Structure formats: structure tokens, C-alpha cells
Amino acid sequence: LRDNIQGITKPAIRRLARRGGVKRISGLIYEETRGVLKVFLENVIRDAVTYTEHAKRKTVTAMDVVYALKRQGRTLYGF
Amino acid sequence: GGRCLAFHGPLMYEHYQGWKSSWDEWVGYDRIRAYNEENIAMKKRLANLQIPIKLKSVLVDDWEYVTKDKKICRLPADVTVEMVLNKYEHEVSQELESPGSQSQLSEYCAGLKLYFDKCLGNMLLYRLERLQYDELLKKSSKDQKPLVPIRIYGAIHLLRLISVLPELISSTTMDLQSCQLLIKQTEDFLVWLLMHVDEY
Amino acid sequence: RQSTGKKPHRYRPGTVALREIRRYQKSTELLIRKLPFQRLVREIAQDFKTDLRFQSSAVMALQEASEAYLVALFEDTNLAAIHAKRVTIMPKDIQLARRIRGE
DNA sequence: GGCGGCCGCTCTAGAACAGGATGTATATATCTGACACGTGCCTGGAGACTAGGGAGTAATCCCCTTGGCGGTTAAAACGCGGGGGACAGCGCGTACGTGCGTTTAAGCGGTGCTAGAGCTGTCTACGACCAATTGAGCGGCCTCGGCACCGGGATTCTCCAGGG
DNA sequence: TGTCCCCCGCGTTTTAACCGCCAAGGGGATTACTCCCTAGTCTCCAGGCACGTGTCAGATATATACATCCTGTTCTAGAGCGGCCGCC
């Protein structure tokens, strides 16, 4: 698996900014948003990996993702 | 192929480009490009050659002779160009022309007939010869028939006709090898008439 | 290895952007596609530990959490853009928002 | 003899550079006030023991995510037209930087007094735990209806063109 | 105030997304046998805490001294002006 950071497409980031009420979207916001999302995923998925390794499980459940989001003050409901 | 090929105003065709799909039309009419109608009328007015010396004595003899006699005195002349034109396909085409298609002789003979059909009134018309043609058209208008000059005109003026075609040949935009072929079959014509001195 | 190698509509910018803002702000469905985000998640996870799997619901929760976080970040970025007398966002506004947030 | 072109001369200003100014960086002198060593305890962890219970491990099982396809229409992406806005630039100004006069309370040190938090008993209900029990929460099945989907139609707000 | 180049609206053609469908096989979930070390005491003792105190580095103090910033004076480059010279 290589070049998967480009899976988050440019109109996907455009629609995400449209949900946030952004009037105009620059052409350099896409790489920065991809980097921010990569950093956030590299934190949350790593925390979920530690949670799964603690429980002697080989696949990561949604509850561990919920715990990893909750421990950083970003708690998620519905899972 | 290419980048600009449209029967209507071009829009980098390689269908109305830059428009929705509900505007197509493929009916058949006349087509004109006009460079997108002069670029939509400058954007709505900014938002609002001679014959060889072989038998050249004939026109010298006949230049003085047509001043008072005009080489003909009988209006229903017995000499017609039809038989002498028909004999070209049986005498010289079967002998001198290289084996193949005789189009270069027959098509030219038909074109000469078509030219002689309407060459009257504009050229080859001496003053009393013009009066004779006027009286021929007067006597031919009593039965509302077209004037057909194949039976009332001799072949003596054909030599003068092939003498006076080359300077009006170059009067129009024309390639030089066509004139070369013209003078080549003129040379063939004078070769054929070099020894056939009785009819001319 | 062995190889040698009539007039169009012409909507002005901003109005359709506000139309999309109104359409997606009242909307509910997920903007980011499923499999590209899942493949990015697997590619990120393979750097930490190999032979790892994610369930569908875990990928769903990660996608919704990331979408909400990025929507909040874009809201802060747009607020900084209007705060800077602008309507176009810049990556330096995103960096400033991340610095203020402490992350 | 008049005039354009050329070069020298003086005027003007940007800027490198040196000197004065004032708030800090240091060099002792000495206070000083907690810092860490010593002492005396003494109060909490360690050796050792009793007992047991929740996970390590094995087995099953069934479940659920990954790979892996065509299909198809939603959409990413390339590109043309163009359009409104980020920013360089310039000008207006005012309002906030700098500096002391003057006032004014912050803080150091002192004294009195009680508001009340530990501290020690005391006595007392209260919740974990053990028999004994029991009743609707939940997995699952039957039913059912609210809004996704599909169009049909429509008001309804928005852009383009004409007139003053 | 301008501008221009950066982004947006839309035409068009690829492009991979999602549902449709099928097995798989590691892997979550459950049940049971067993076993070590953790719950809970007994005793004590050696490391941890309260108190006392010599002390050694930090702060106050001040002439001396940095130290860079602000500003005055001069140096040198640039544009403007005027005198001189050659040509028509």
C-alpha cells in the first residue's frame, strides 16, 4: 500500500470545507489538510493499536477507537 | 484529425462545444465556416506560345483575301467541320497517338465543337462577315429554332481559331503545362494539315 | 529490468459555494468516500504494526471522527480568515489554529 | 549665425559610521535563609504463611473481514473562460508608544482575635456479604408504517438585459 | 486602487465506489482445567519522616562596565542645470 494519502481527494476536502462554511478554498489547503489528517490518524490509529495489543486481539474494534478518541478529549458517540 | 474542422463556427472541434447536451442538431443544409462569422462579428463590435514556323503562309494569304470576298459566297456552305472532325478518330488517332485512351483527341474535339457553338458574336467576325451572320440569324429566327453553326460554317476559320486561342489561354490563371499540352496538340493539328492542303 | 522505458448561465464564484455550504450544512451523509479512507487507514496502520485488520464499524467511527475534527478545523480556519479580513483560507491559518488548539 | 548634443559643476539625499544614553550583565561584600546532614524515632513495607480465584492455555465455533471480481452511473480530474479578491502600494489619521508629575495604594512589619480545621473519643446507622427469591430486560419473531426513492409540479429567489 | 494570477463553474471523458454476490480463514467470543500470586494476617526493622542546626549559594548594593539603539555628521552616488562645441 503506497500513495494512499492521495485517496482523500481534492473535492472531498472541498466538500469538508463546505460543511464548515468556508467561502473560498485555496489550492494549497489540500496538502496541508492531508498532512493534518495524516497526523491525526497516526495518533488515533496508533493509540487503537496499543489498545488492541493490550487486549491480545489481532483486529481493532470500534470500542478501542472510541477509547482512543475519548482519552484525548474528543469523545465519539454512536459506536 | 487536426484541431479545427467544423461546418459551423469552429469551437476547437476534433456538436456545439461548451454547451449542454440538449442542443444538438444533425440536419442537412449548406455549410459555411466564415471564421466563426468573423469571430461573432468582432465580438459584437467589441460589446457594441506562338505557332511554329511550319505552314504559316495560310493566314498571310487569307488576311488580304477576306477584305472583299471573306472566303465564302454560298450561305449553305458544302464544307463542314463535322466530317473532318470525325476523321480524326479514324485517321490520326489510330496511327500517331500512342496506344491507350484517345480521350486527349476525342474530348478535345468535343470541347472544340462546344466552343464553336457559342464563339460567334464575340470573336472571328469581320464586318461584312458580321453582317452575314446577322442575316443568317435573321433568316434562322423565322422558325424559332436555335442557331446551330455546324451546317452553315466552313472549316477555314478553324485555323484562325487555333491561331487566336493561345493569348486568351494565358489571360486567365492557368498552369503552364496545360498550355504546353495545348501547343502540343496544336503542333499535332498542323502536322496533320501539313500535307492535307485541299480542304484548307 | 530489461526495458528501455445564445448565452450561458456563467455563475459567478461564491454563490454556488454558498449553495453547497447550505446544502451540506443541512445534510447528513458522509462526504469522504469509504474505501480511499479505509486504504489510507490501513497504510498508516501498517507502519506501526503489520498484518492488522479493521472492521467496517471501526472504519466508520474513524471516518466520522476525522470528518467532524476536520469540519471543526475548517470552521476555525474560516473564522480566522474572516478575522484576517479575508474570504479565502490559507494553510498558515490552519497552522495558527493548530497552534492555538495546542496540537 | 542659431540650435542640439556632450561633459563638467553644483545641489541633494541614502546610507555607512561613530558618539551619547540608559537599562541591564557582572565583580566583589556581606547578609541570610532555606539546604541538606545528622539524630531520633516509629510507622509502613518486607519475609513468611494461609488459601483461592481469575487468567494462561486449550478447544470449539461461528462469524465477519479481505480478497475479488463485473456494472453502472456519481464523480474525480483536465482544461477553458473568466472573475472577483490577496496583496503591493499609497495616503489619512488618530491613538497608542514614550516620558515624567503626581497621587495612591501595595507591601513589610506589628498586634489582637476569633473563624475554624485537625485531633481524640463516642456511639450509631450503613453497606458488603450470605440465603432466598423473582420479574421484566433482551434475543428473536411478527407486524407495520415513515420516510428514501421516483417522479410531477411549482412557487421562488436569482441572474441577464433594457430603460432612465 | 489596480492586477493578475489563483481559484471557481462548467463541458467531457475516464475512474474507481458501492452495492451484488462467494468463499476463506484468521480471529472475536464462549466454556472449562488448572495454577500462581494476589487478598489478608503476624511480626519487625530498616528505610522514611519530624526536628535541630552549620552552612553555602542566591540577593541586595553600587561603582564599573557592557550593549545595542537612536541620532548627528560626513561620504559618496545620482539627477538637474548650464557652458562649450560642431553642424546646417
Output the domain CATH number for residue A5: 1.10.20.10
Whether the Cβ atoms of residue A34 and residue C98 lie closer than 8 Å to each other = no
**Partners of residue B19 in chain C, C-beta under 8 Å:** 6, 8
Q: How was this structure determined?
A: cryo-EM
Q: Which residue has the cell 440536419?
A: B27
SS3 (DSSP) at A24 = strand
Residue B113: φ, ψ to 5°: -65, -45
Name B116's Cβ contacts closer than 8 Å, sequence gap at least 6. Answer: B81, B149, B150, B153, B158, B161
User: Nearest by CB to A23, which of C41, C45, C87?
Assistant: C87
Spell out where chain C is interrupted, by the residue before each break (C to N > 2.5 A).
Answer: 5
How far apart are the C-alpha atoms of A60 and B100, rounded to whole Å?
92
Q: Pairing between strand A59-60 and C53-54?
A: parallel
Q: Which domain holds residue A61?
A: 1-79
**At CA B119, angle to CA B114 and CA B122, rounded to 5?**
160
CA of A28 to C1' of D120 (A): 73
Look at chain A and report how many structural domains it folds into: 1
Check if the beta carbon of residue C55 is closer than 8 Å to that of residue A13: no
- Collect all residues of chain B within an 8 Å Cβ-Cβ radius of residue C11: none
Q: Using the beta-carbon criterion (under 8 Å), do C66 and A37 form an inter-chain contact? A: yes
**Rounded Cα–Cα distance for residues A38 and A6 (Å):** 11
Which single residue is written with the C-alpha cell 467589441? B46
Write the CA distances from C24 to A1, B40, C67, C77, C80, integer angstroms. 32, 41, 13, 18, 21
In this complex, the nucleotide whose C1' atom is nearest to the CA atom of residue C85 is D86
C-alpha cell at C37: 479512507
Closest nucleotide to the alpha carbon of A58, via C1': E27
Q: How many CB atoms lie within 10 A of CB A1?
A: 11
Nearest CA in chain C to B18: C8
Q: Which of C35, C38, C54, C70 to mutate to test the interface with A (most CBs of A within 10 A)?
A: C70
- Which amino acid, residue A16? L
Report if CB C15 to strand E is under 7 Å: yes
Cα–Cα distance between B40 and B50 in angstroms, integer? Answer: 52
Q: Which residues have CB under 7 A from strand D? A: A 6, 9-12, 15, 24, 56, 59; C 7, 9-15, 53-57, 84-88, 90
What's the CA gap between B179 and B165, in Å, rounded? 10
How far apart are the C-alpha atoms of C103 and C83, rounded to whole Å? 21
- Count residue pairs from A and C with Cβ separation < 8 A: 177
C55 with A61: CB under 8 angstroms? yes
Closest CB from A4, A19, A61 relative to C40: A4
Q: With b meaning 16 or more CB within 10 Å and e meaning fewer, what string describes B107-144? A: ebbeebeeebeebbeeebbeeebeebbeebeeeeeeee
- The residue assigned the cell 470500542 is A63
Give residue numbers after which chain B breaks (C–N above 2.5 Å): 14, 48
Q: Of B59, B41, B38, B42, whose CA–CA distance to B50 is shortest?
A: B59
Report the nucleotide nearest the CA of residue C90, measured to C1'. D86
Question: Cβ distance C36 to C63 under 8 Å?
Answer: no
Report yes or no: C81 and C89 within 8 Å, Cβ to Cβ: yes
Contact A1, C36 (CB under 8 A): no
C-alpha C61/C-alpha B182 separation (Å) is 92
